[PDB]
Backbone:
């Protein structure tokens, strides 16, 4: 099953909700990730150019997909097929971001 | 600010998360709505045809936008500009639904 991460739209996009599969994949419990930016999933071998593409997409509230090297709580690397989409209201205000996380290792 | 409702994809789409604006708009605290289908927001003056359109869209996991009459916890009616989108993984599995709620009574 694919994980899901929901963040606030502003500040530094703190996590406000994760589903069960997020914990299955990453080894982190909800309580230890809520209020944090999801970048804690990154590590030494994470590709900087990929991170920059995510950074730009989020800044512009544009949908993006990347295959990015992430790390479980225990430090084991995994390949994360990550898809991020903005959540907008009818007036175009960005309410939140939703990320889908699939372990494609 | 617009409210947000996140539900599971299956088994009559129980609410798994709401943002603070949801509480401001509807008068319900998270604890009062988690694990329930959002249809408790509806009431007697809610348009049945609108509800039917939502029902069919959600069953097919299709995005839908409707203006629907809803009710706060205390029974006060309000017009809800509601936008629902499925969340899918790249294999096409529906992971969740996300609803945006805007009070457009005024
Ligand atoms: C909803 C959402 C989910 C995210 N999920 C992940 C993730 O699973 N793995 C990851 O490495 N980054 C993820 N990110 C990206 C980071 O949070 C961050 O935006 C990215 O590293 C670029 O910003 P930075 O250069 O400040 O790190 C997610 C971002 C958002 C908004
Ligand atoms: C994510 C999500 C959010 C929803 N938000 C609302 C809402 O704010 N107001 C509402 O009247 N119905 C809302 N619904 C629709 C009801 O939960 C339900 O799907 C609809 O009433 C049709 O089913 P029914 O005929 O069994 O009631 C939402 C559904 C989903 C999946």
Residues:
């Amino acid at each position: 099953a694919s994980g899901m991460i929901v963040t606030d739209a502003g500040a530094d996009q703190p996590i406000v909700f994760v589903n069960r599969a997020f914990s299955t994949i990453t080894g982190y419990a909800p309580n230890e990730v809520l209020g944090r930016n999801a970048r804690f999933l990154q590590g030494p071998q994470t590709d900087a150019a990929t991170v920059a593409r995510l950074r730009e997409a989020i800044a512009a509230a544009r949908p993006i997909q990347e295959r990015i090297l992430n790390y479980r709580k225990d430090g084991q690397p995994f390949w994360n097929q990550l898809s991020i989409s903005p959540v907008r209201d009818e007036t175009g205000n960005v309410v939140a971001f939703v990320g889908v996380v699939t372990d494609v290792t």
In short: The two ends of chain A are 14 Å apart (CA to CA). Chain A has one domain: 3-101.
